[PDB]
Ligand binder design. Structure first.
Ligand SMILES: [Mg+2]
Ligand SMILES: [Mg+2]
Ligand SMILES: [Mg+2]
Ligand SMILES: [Mg+2]
Ligand SMILES: [Mg+2]
Ligand SMILES: [Mg+2]
Ligand SMILES: [Mg+2]
Ligand SMILES: [Mg+2]
Ligand SMILES: [Mg+2]
Ligand SMILES: [Mg+2]
Lengths: 210, 124, 119, 61, 141
RNA sequence: UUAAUAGGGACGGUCGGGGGCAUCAGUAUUCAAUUGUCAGAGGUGAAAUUCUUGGAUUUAUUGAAGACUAACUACUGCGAAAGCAUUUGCCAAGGACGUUUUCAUUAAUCAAGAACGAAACUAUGCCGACUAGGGAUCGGGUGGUGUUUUUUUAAUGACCCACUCGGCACCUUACGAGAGGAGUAUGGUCGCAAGGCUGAAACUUAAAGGAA
């Protein structure tokens, strides 16, 4: 029985917070008989199976946990990844647009004023969403992750997320009505040739006198 | 932009999360989230016509307490912003004078005491 | 100990449990969540994946294989790189059925540079 | 008050409390629910003690 | 301070305060003049002559050592250019870009840079025409 | 006559995801050829539509086509802006730095003119001719120092510290004449509008509906 291991590097600024919580991380992983190591010299965190490990798939969740911790997700939130329902998704957004200003403004649109748009999406989708640089890292149930991807990608294609927030609220009330389960919900939802050589310059008045 | 329910939910999302499907409907919402939500709504309507001094009044606190409360809250904001800055996290924009509204703002009801900003510095 | 290769393809809408020989050219047993459930909504469920793995595991024991290397993957490409719920449940079911799990690897198709238009 | 405004349980119980307090004499009026907070005071209860009622009935100076 | 650019650099040479020859310099002034004439005969420009003398012959400045500039020394000996050295290099650079634009007609950047170079030629040519160093009829290309 | 901490040109080692033309690679997608197996596969909140025992989806090997250049990717670099991210070669061009090289006022701002050139949807910053700074970072240069490095094959860097010039930003500071909103009411004007079961009126009139 060979040992399956995963290792993830983390930034140096994130070292201080990992040192404090590593006892909690060790305790959480010990419940599944998964051993972990925190190397501050190399700046890496490793998770490895043991001979007492019984769940074959837990190492994959343990790998996701250390990845989340490296990306500045707080441990009380990240430790939920060990649960079967929860999953982690990373959405690229750097490739949708080519104008820097248009990229920045649309990304802010995802956050919204005071973070209101982002918080509303998290509440409706039950997902933890964190917008970083050219990517959006979202964690939560698989149904929520699927919804978050649509909103994030649509935002970068000029669809205001406020439409998606409204759509999710309407879909939720419809999900609680049994009569309209079969019927389509769309009606309720809101709707000369180039010359290489320059032309000559107009001479200055002094040039004319010369 | 003119949907009252949708706009209300977006503005009130921070209070509802702090004091918790999410119960955002008025009939469903109970507890502190109800009391804070009603007050938040009533202040918004009163801002248009009510005089600035009269509508909002910071609760009376001694100086050595309030100055201490402001200092600790500002330190939390700086830590929050530095941690986001050193990471890649994108944060909502805040005007220069105003304090950023971190999660601790909503839970601790800090604004009723310290206020949105230091008025003395804003006036000058 | 005769070794196979269990190729699990866990999409958000379905889960394939496919066991083959080490080369991969010879299919031994392919079972899907859709064949083990009656409704289209539950194909992606962990339960449907669990039934699929048990059917595959029994067939693998018939032919002679007793251990398998796991190669799980997601839809990949321009879409999600995260395996769905079924893949994780399918992996557990193979172990409980008794087949030895040799090695687990994620082989999701990751494009260097997607076919997505910047414009 | 923290129960939702249209709750039948909320409306029933607030009325029962207003009924009982008015009957005791602690509350002068039954119209407003805010009286349970603003107008419920020790002075209101002391104002129903036997000496005070004798005074208001002019049985004593 | 750059014209046709946003750079504000100040890199330059700092001529020493004293205007007399260095004490350690112990070569005849006439010998320096002959060296200048020889290099000009070989085809070196006045700017390049000063570099060689300064680098290898200890001539800190031709004016300080000999009392006359390199340009005046050469002209006294019959050596003088067709056109001022700075104008000579501007024209050569314009020619090279025009040659490149001939082979590469899609290089819009080179087209932009050529406008800047020809503009520099016109401003520089106009100055020399005013001072009469350049004949009044002279026109670029 | 100086040789402006004005301007130009020259030379030296450099710097760059600046431009043009070729060239190289990468996994992904689509298609195709074989290839093992067999009943579903994609998609949705459900479906519908689409493919499928002529083998779909999935598996292995291989080929072709178009696009793109992930992670590294930064409040970093280059470009006048729009913009620019694989390798190598060529073609010119450019910035800063270094210079005891050269011209000698050749300059600054500029209406006209010339070159290049679905989208928005919560934002915001007193301004200037203007003082002294701090941390970090990019490029160049000088000096110190001792670790990586290494030796008469040629090349010959990385890190630490101080100083300095020029950039992208951040955080602070001294100085300055820099010369309508929210509502209410309506004996006016213009529109929109009430009612009585339908059939059914010149007809107290059928069948069938409506209400009950
Ligand atoms: Mg220059
Ligand atoms: Mg000078
Ligand atoms: Mg040069
Ligand atoms: Mg180059
Ligand atoms: Mg190139
Ligand atoms: Mg390219
Ligand atoms: Mg770079
Ligand atoms: Mg720039
Ligand atoms: Mg690359
Ligand atoms: Mg500097």
């Amino acid at each position: 029985a060979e040992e399956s291991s995963f290792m993830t590097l983390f930034p140096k600024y994130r070292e201080s917070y990992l040192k404090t919580i590593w006892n909690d991380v060790t305790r959480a992983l010990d419940k599944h008989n998964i051993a972990c190591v925190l190397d501050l010299v190399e700046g890496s965190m490793t998770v490895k199976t043991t001979r007492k490990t019984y769940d074959p798939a837990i190492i994959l969740k343990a790998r996701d946990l250390i990845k989340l911790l490296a990306r500045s997700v707080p441990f009380p939130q990240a430790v939920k990844i060990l649960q079967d329902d929860m999953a982690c998704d990373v959405i690229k957004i750097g490739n949708f647009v080519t104008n820097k200003e248009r990229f920045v403004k649309r990304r802010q649109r995802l956050v919204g004023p005071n973070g209101n748009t982002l918080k509303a999406l998290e509440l409706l989708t039950k997902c933890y969403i964190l917008v970083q640089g050219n990517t959006v890292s979202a964690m939560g149930p698989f149904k929520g992750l699927k919804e978050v991807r649509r909103v994030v990608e649509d935002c970068m294609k000029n669809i205001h997320p406020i439409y998606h927030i409204k759509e999710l609220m309407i879909k939720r009330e419809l999900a609680k009505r049994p009569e309209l389960a079969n019927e389509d919900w769309s009606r309720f939802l809101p709707m000369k040739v180039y010359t290489p050589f320059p032309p000559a310059q107009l001479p200055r008045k002094v040039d004319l006198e010369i | 932009q003119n949907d009252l329910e949708l706009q209300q939910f977006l503005r009130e999302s921070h209070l509802l999360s702090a004091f918790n499907g999410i119960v955002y409907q008025d009939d469903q919402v109970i507890g502190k989230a109800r009391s804070r939500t009603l007050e938040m709504r009533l202040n918004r309507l009163s801002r248009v016509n009510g005089h600035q001094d009269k509508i909002n009044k910071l609760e009376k606190v001694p100086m050595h307490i309030r100055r201490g409360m402001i200092d600790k809250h500002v330190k939390r904001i700086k830590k929050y912003e530095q941690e986001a800055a050193e990471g890649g996290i994108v944060l909502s924009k805040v005007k220069k004078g105003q304090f950023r509204k971190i999660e601790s703002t909503y839970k601790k009801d800090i604004e009723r005491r310290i206020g949105g900003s230091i008025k003395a510095r804003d006036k000058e | 100990q005769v070794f196979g290769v269990a190729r699990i393809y866990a999409s958000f809408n379905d889960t394939f449990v496919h066991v083959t020989d080490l080369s991969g050219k010879e299919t031994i047993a392919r079972v899907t969540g859709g064949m083990k459930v009656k409704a289209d909504r539950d194909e992606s469920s962990p339960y449907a994946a669990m039934l699929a793995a048990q059917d595959v595991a029994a067939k693998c024991k018939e032919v002679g294989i007793t251990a398998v290397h796991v190669k799980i993957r997601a839809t990949g490409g321009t879409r999600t790189k995260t395996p769905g719920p079924g893949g994780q449940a399918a992996l557990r079911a193979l172990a409980r059925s008794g087949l030895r799990i040799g090695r687990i690897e994620d082989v999701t198709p990751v494009p260097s540079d997607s076919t997505r238009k910047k414009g | 008050s923290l129960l939702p405004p249209t709750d039948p349980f909320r409306r029933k119980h607030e009325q029962l409390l207003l009924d009982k307090l008015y009957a005791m004499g602690v509350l002068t009026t039954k119209s407003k629910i805010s009286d349970l907070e603003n107008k419920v005071t020790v002075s209101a209860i002391c104002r129903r003690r036997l000496p005070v009622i004798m005074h208001r009935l002019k049985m004593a100076e | 301070g750059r014209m046709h650019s946003a750079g504000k650099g100040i890199s330059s040479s700092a001529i020493p305060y004293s205007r007399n020859a260095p004490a350690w310099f112990k070569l005849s002034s006439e010998s320096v003049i002959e060296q200048i004439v020889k290099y000009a005969r070989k085809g070196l420009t006045p700017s390049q002559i000063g570099v060689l003398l300064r680098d290898a012959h200890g001539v800190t400045q031709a004016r300080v050592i000999t009392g006359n500039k390199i340009m005046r020394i050469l002209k006294s000996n019959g050596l003088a250019p067709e056109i001022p050295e700075d104008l000579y290099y501007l024209i050569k650079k314009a020619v090279s870009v025009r040659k490149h634009l001939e082979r590469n007609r899609k290089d819009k950047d080179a087209k932009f840079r050529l406008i800047l170079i020809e503009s520099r030629i016109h401003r520089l040519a106009r100055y020399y025409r005013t001072v009469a160093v350049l004949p009044p009829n002279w026109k670029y290309e």
